[PDB]
């Protein structure tokens, strides 16, 4: 049983960066896979990045390839999403989800534990 809270959202100029964090509360943080997802208004929620509990490299959507880095600090019960070279198309609510690493699922939508999401807006309008 784990509770998740995203933070680090904002409104950022095109070409800028953010780092989202997803803080877990509950037992055995080290036994959970964690996944980042994003949802734009009127669109299906989509996979961004996932990180496991082994040495293995994380997984990334083709939509972010190379721009994004997911990482975990097991001591801080925190997963991060560094987001570089942001574009307007990256605007969405970003969500973190957790599932026990031994459980196999067909979709990220089957992860049991979700945060409330953090809003990311990327704007080429120089209000910066």
Q: What is the DSSP string of the chain?
A: -EEEEEE--EEEETT--EEEEEEEEES-GGGEEEEEEEE-TTS--EEEEEE-SSSPPPEE-TTTTTTEEEEEEGGGTEEEEEE-S--GGG-EEEEEEEEETT---SSGGG-SEE---EEEEEE-S---
Domain boundaries, the chain: 2-123
Bridge-based pairing of strands 18-26 and 78-83 is: antiparallel
Query: Both tokens of residue 92?
Result: 């969405």
How far is C-alpha 50 from the chain's CA centre? Answer: 8
Instruction: Check if the beta carbon of residue 70 is closer than 8 Å to that of residue 79.
Output: yes
Instruction: Tell me the structure's resolution in angstroms, rounded to a single decimal.
Output: 2.0
Closest CA to 46 of 24, 67, 64, 58: 64
Separation of alpha carbons 4 and 23, rounded Å: 6
CATH fold, domain 2-123, is Immunoglobulin-like (2.60.40)
Instruction: Check if the beta carbon of residue 24 is closer than 8 Å to that of residue 37.
Output: no
Residue 98's Cβ-count burial label (10 Å; 0-12, 13-18, 19+) is buried
Instruction: Check if the beta carbon of residue 85 is closer than 8 Å to that of residue 63.
Output: no
Residue 35, beta-bridge partner list: 50, 97
Give the method of determination.
X-ray
Bridge-based pairing of strands 92-100 and 113-114 is: antiparallel
């Amino acid at each position: 049983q784990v509770q998740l809270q995203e933070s680090g959202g904002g409104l950022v100029q095109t070409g800028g960066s953010l780092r989202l964090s997803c803080k877990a509360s509950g037992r055995a943080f080290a036994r959970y896979d964690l996944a980042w997802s994003r949802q734009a208004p009127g669109k299906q929620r989509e996979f961004v990045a996932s990180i496991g509990v082994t040495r293995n490299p994380p997984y990334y959507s083709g939509s972010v390839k190379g721009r994004f880095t997911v990482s975990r600090d097991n001591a801080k019960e925190t997963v991060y999403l560094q987001m570089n070279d942001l574009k307007p198309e990256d605007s969405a609510v970003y969500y973190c989800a957790a599932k026990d690493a031994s459980v196999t699922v067909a979709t990220i939508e089957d992860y049991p534990y979700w945060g409330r999401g953090t809003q990311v807006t990327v704007s080429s309008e120089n209000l910066y």
